[PDB]
Structures are given as C-alpha cells and as structure tokens.
C-alpha cells in the first residue's frame, strides 16, 4: 500500500515495502498546544503498537489514510 511520510524535507507518500501495510499518524502538542501544539508525524507500519497518553499514534489499514489533520485538500 501507500502511506504518507514526514521524514523527508516536504511531506509525501510512498509504497511501503513487503513488510508494512498500515500507516501511522502521531500527534502530541509541542510546547505550544496553544499556537503550535500537536506535533504531526507520518509513517508506515505493519501493525498498531502501544501508545502513551501523550505521544499517541493513529494507525489505519488503508492508502493515504494518515494525512495531516490540517493538510490542504485537493
């Protein structure tokens, strides 16, 4: 499948190799929950591991399923 990543410079989406089928989106307010806040992470994953009350990650089983919460539509 294909998931969205935020490791590179800009945000893009690739096809996870023969290992990961699910995507993930991490969120946690960076010391600016008022201004900046919830840090947005992007990446692929095979399964949905645990998650702390703060640094949580939403895993899904679909393509381009882990887009930025405030990503521009189009």
């Amino acid at each position: 499948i294909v998931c969205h990543t935020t490791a590179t410079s800009p945000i893009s989406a690739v096809t996870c190799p023969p290992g990961e089928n699910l995507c993930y989106r991490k969120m946690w307010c960076d010391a600016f929950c008022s201004s900046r806040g919830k840090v947005v992470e992007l990446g692929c994953a095979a399964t949905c591991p645990s998650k702390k009350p703060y640094e949580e990650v939403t895993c899904c089983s679909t393509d381009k399923c882990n887009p930025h919460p405030k990503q521009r539509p189009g």
């Binding site: 935020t6 410079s9 800009p10 945000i11 991490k26 969120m27 307010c29 960076d30 600016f32 201004s35 900046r36 806040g37 919830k38 840090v39 947005v40 992470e41 992007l42 930025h68 919460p69 405030k70 990503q71 521009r72």
Partner: peptide, 13 residues
Amino acid sequence: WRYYESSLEPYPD
C-alpha cells in the same frame, strides 16, 4: 524533524 499541527511546514529540533 517533523511538522506541527498548526502548519504543514517542516519543523527541525
């Protein structure tokens, strides 16, 4: 580095 919810730009640390 990653991005914050307040924007879509890259954010280093």
